[PDB]
């Protein structure tokens, strides 16, 4: 399964949850409220580089393991950045 | 944009009183393995001192200057044994890491 | 609250001597099951020094700053030699978290 | 048998019967005064969990094991704790 | 009053050079009843040491530390053949916890 | 037999027999100095009670076995433990 | 008020030979925890001179100047040490700092 | 239990308290003259604060803990602080 | 790949407490065959300590640096005596090693 | 009388050589108990110094600052083997002390 | 048996037996002369305190274990106090 | 007169240099009766040295500081085995005294 969302578009995804002031950001995003380990560690590693986006390690991870249409929308509604519904 | 640099520099700065809790590694951990960016005399010097915390402070002070520290956390991931919740710490090391970058957007 | 690991820690170093009694099984106790936390040369270390009681000592001093201590109890209970009055012991060590907890709670 | 006391209520209970500055507490609340041993222990261990409640545990059991009704409150006015009874 | 045991444990060790007399069956006293509460590897540590004497010592070295120490009494009844004596014994045995008890009364 | 002394008044017979720094005490109570034995040694026993009383042992066994009424009182007297006869 | 840095300037001075007591801790107590408001090169300076006593006076000699000295009653706390009579101290400490406050209400 | 005494005039309360040149102060007040301890120390950390009252923080906490309704006032005229009874 | 040989060293460690059950054949097992790539003088090293728990301990210590460590698990086979449930070990064995494979792939 | 502080210190200053005595159980008496007032860095900084002798001037040294080193008057109660004639030493702690006060008195 | 004797008027028993600049004090007062031991050590331990009087431990257990009425006074002139046979 | 103690260490350290004759029973004598004042880790310490002369070097060490070393007298008429010459000792140890407090009779 691959997401395959618009990556000039995803770009903005990733962007939002970075610049995330509140306390729930990627990894409460990651913990996704009601629910594989390692590879998260690996996700949080890719920060030292200079164009590092956790965020895109969480998301083309989280695109395959599952084609996440909008299944992630409704999660994301629960986790009060409802900026991505206001955007997508 | 050989500016991450600094935000290195300041994290390890801020984050500087949680070295003690699990840094008392200081020859298990970089004596070996830092070696490839250390110098043979600076491990001398480190083990001068008989604080065993004061130790690892220059440890650290070593480490601040040189651009590439981590070299250190690559270091903290080969010793399982810290690991667990060394993870802890590099993800502690890692959130203190993102809150940097989020000032330097500003 | 990431904060219980603070009150751990405090309540081990009121239990400090009490140390003495049960757990001069040092080479006993951890060497086999805390190897999934602690680290081979850690193990050398310890028994470098020739007291027995003081062995203990630094056992627990390594113990002190990882903040998942409780591996110890879990340990306590596999072994049933000293574990029905180690129970005593976790009891009394159940207590101490107890006090500790409520002075949190403030 | 199952007590099945209210539970919002019965955070109140958990709740005095844990902030006992009183020599006599849980512990001795499990003595009965004047009476199922390991069970102690693992209700003791749920203390390391951040919302640990070693009453609820030994409240949950003594729920069971006989659907205690009032049956507690007698035991618990001769424990001087009579501030259950001052509430219910 | 959870403090018996600190007079127990004064006990045995004012009564510690009675142990060569009888308590020679070191091997045959503990090493099946008080499996009940002592280690397999105990055992063989106490076996280890070839004075016969010795032996005994670490012994009741393990049995000081454990709180509930009267096992080694229990145990003392079981085997009737030192009894009769160890019965002086144990009666020298509840002498002396007679005395320390008294002077805990002050 | 039973010698159904007062128990509360019995109280300061088990602790003046007990309290004995002199060389006599319970032992030599039982060899009645003119005068049933493995009791002894359970009656001893009773020492790793907290409430230990082996006086109170070497009582209700002598309490039966013969109604011992001012009979253990010449023999106390002959103990030179006289301050029993100065208290009862 | 932005007046009552001076009143704590003062108060630091009339204590000033209190210094000598617990806080030979010069090394152990600003050289980590300040360093969110010191200087590196500040530390080695301190560090330079031998008297052990001397040491701590300049050490509070850099203090005067920084607005915010609190940050050393607050590192006061943190270390559970000294803290107990430190408390003392520090309730020493408090104390003064009402004498000087009623004084400037006049 | 909550005190709710007049916050207005508290305000005088707290003053007089302050202002205090006897050597007997908040600090003896706590001593209670007859009578719970790292709270004391954190009431006496607020005294860094420009507003600082440490009689602030021992009256709000002495407003828990027991509704101190002229309970303090005996003990105050046992301080000889009877500028309060001359007040209120 | 070149490295099987971590994750067999990995699998060893994890295992580590279930060498007391049926390794307790320290003397019987690996003196005799392993000694095609064992020394005569770590066969003395190992029989010193008279632990005869801790012994199976340092066996294991030496063979987790060997890379073909899997010379035991043919030793395993070789005795008939344990293999029924050794069988059970070295499918306990096998299993473990399925699991870390399995991480490896991630 | 928040005095009787200055006394204690010069009490003890006046005893110091009788230290060397008994309380070469530097390593013994306080790393274990003092614990509750002293710190964990000041235990390795004793430890520091190989005089044997100078190890405990080291422990007084730290000892008088604290203003509640009755403490160390209570470890000595603790361990009942020096206690006998420590009690010798206490009672010989004690009447310097007696001195001192009728001198405050004067 | 309890000495009872007058407190205020104990006081001054107690600070002359303190202020002893003869090498014999409380120490030999408690030898006798002529004749139990850790009390000694516990009564000696109560000089840390403000009010302490070591000398008021060894006449109160003295007023016990024997109702030492002008019996001490004897001892006290073998010792040579005769201060206090010239004050009472 | 509370000066026969040093006569009593004068006379231990002018005998020092026949230690080794007969009190080659360092396990042997005090490890059982003189630890009615000697520690449990005092005795460990003793074991730890591998000399078997200074071994007992380090007893007599530890016995100089205790005013009562004449325990170990007491404890070298109980054992008859050295006795009859360890008497000739005794005689010895006795003879030495008296020489001693000649000396301090001037």
Chains 1, 4, 6, 8, 11 share one sequence.
């Not at chain 1, 610049?19 to 920060?47: I, N, Y």
């Not at chain 1, 084609?67 to 629960?78: H, K, M, N």
């Not at chain 2, 480190?46 to 002070?61: F, P, Y």
């Not at chain 2, 070299?71 to 044994?81: A, G, N, Q, Y």
């Amino acid at each position: 399964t691959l997401n395959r969302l618009r990556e000039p578009l995803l770009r903005r995804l990733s962007e939002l949850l970075d610049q995330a002031p509140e306390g729930r950001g990627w990894r409460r995003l990651a913990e996704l409220a009601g629910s594989s380990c390692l590879d998260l560690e690996q996700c949080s590693l890719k920060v030292l580089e200079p164009e590092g986006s956790p965020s895109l390690c969480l998301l083309k991870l989280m695109g395959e393991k599952g084609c996440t249409v909008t299944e992630l929308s409704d999660f994301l509604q629960a986790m009060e950045h409802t900026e991505v519904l206001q955007l997508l | 944009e050989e500016d991450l640099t600094e935000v290195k520099k300041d994290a390890l700065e801020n984050l500087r009183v949680y070295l003690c809790e699990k840094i008392i590694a200081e020859r298990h951990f970089d004596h070996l393995r830092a070696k490839k960016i250390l110098s043979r005399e600076d491990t001398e010097e480190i083990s001068c001192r008989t604080s065993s915390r004061k130790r690892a402070g220059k440890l650290l002070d070593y480490l601040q200057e040189n651009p590439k520290g981590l070299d250190t956390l690559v270091e903290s991931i080969r010793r399982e044994k810290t690991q667990n919740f060394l993870i802890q710490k590099i993800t502690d090391e890692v959130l203190k890491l993102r809150n940097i970058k989020l000032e330097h957007l500003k």
